[PDB]
Structures are given as C-alpha cells and as structure tokens.
Design a protein around this ligand. Structure first.
Ligand SMILES: O=C(O)c1cnc2ccccc2c1
Length: 167
C-alpha cells in the first residue's frame, strides 16, 4: 500500500491523475519525483521550472554544481539528485525535445531510467514544451516502465483525452 490518492488505474503498474506535480509532491513526499530535465539541468520552464521554483531555486543551485563536476547529461539519460522539500530524491530525466529536433526513439531510453526505482511520481516525458505527442508518451511509458509509476497530468483537458484514448 502507498500514499498516492485519486489516481485513475491504467495497467498493473501505471496510474494517472489530473494533478499539479508540485502540489502532488508537496502532499505525498514521494521517495522519487521525476523532473522533465534538459541536458544542462537548466530548469527554466515547464515541470523543471515549476519544480525548481517550488524549491526556492535550491534545485538549480545543486544542478549547477552537478554540471560543473560531471558535464551535461545525454538525451535519454538521467541523474539522481536531492528532492529538496518535494521528495527524498529527484530523478532528472532527459526526454527528447522535438522543438530542438531530437530523435523521438530516445523517448523509450528516457523511460527506461524509471525502472531503476520501485515507485515514482512523474510527468509524461517529452510532453508539454518538449513538443512530443502526450498520447505517444503515455504509450511508451506503459510499454517501457515496469516499476510503479504515478503520472501527474497538468491539463485537465489533456488528462481526459489521455484516459478516453487509452488502449
Ligand atoms: O506538466 C507541466 O507541463 C507543467 C507546466 N507548468 C507547471 C506550472 C506549475 C506547476 C506545474 C506545472 C506543470
């Protein structure tokens, strides 16, 4: 049994809810929240900016030190950093950004990072300002992630479309 509440069941391991991811993290304090990161861990907009703002910029300070030491992530890759006030850990995952011309086949590689964690709170990778089709992102998620994933969809309209169209 876990703390996640109100989630619509999709499969054996994937759950979905219309939720503000900052607000969900603040309430649950999950072991792992996933950030929709870029390779530079520059948390300007979307989920990354929202999450970072909720940490009072401490996520960005930590991220800048990580990049200064390790250099950029790979598209499809990830790193584990602090969850600050939101979670125990933040898994920063880089899905391909269609608005930069990145290979959408890298979306499966991105989701494979989730399998290293038994339970996660996450957004749909490569959705929103990353430019991918969220219906596609949900399909790749269900077909790739084997661990227990609780997906927070920001748009109520999109949430309803994802549920209604789910095979
Ligand atoms: O899911 C997103 O794309 C997203 C974008 N903006 C946000 C702003 C505040 C809180 C959550 C957000 C989530």
């Amino acid at each position: 049994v876990n703390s996640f509440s109100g989630y619509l069941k999709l499969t054996d391991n994937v759950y979905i809810k219309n939720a503000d991811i900052v607000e969900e993290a603040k309430k649950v304090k999950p072991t792992v929240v996933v950030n929709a990161a870029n390779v530079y861990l520059k948390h300007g907009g979307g989920v990354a900016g929202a999450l970072n703002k909720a940490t009072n910029n401490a996520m960005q300070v930590e991220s800048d030190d990580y990049i200064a030491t390790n250099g950029p992530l790979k598209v499809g890759g990830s790193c584990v950093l602090s969850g600050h006030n939101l979670a125990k850990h933040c898994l920063h995952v880089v899905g391909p950004n269609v608005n930069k011309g990145e290979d959408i086949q890298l979306l499966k590689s991105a989701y494979e990072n989730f399998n290293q964690h038994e339970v996660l709170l996450a957004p749909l990778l490569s959705a929103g300002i990353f430019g991918a089709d969220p219906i596609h992102s949900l399909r790749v998620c269900v077909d790739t992630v084997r661990t227990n994933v609780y997906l927070a969809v920001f748009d109520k309209n999109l949430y309803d479309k994802l549920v209604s169209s789910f095979l």
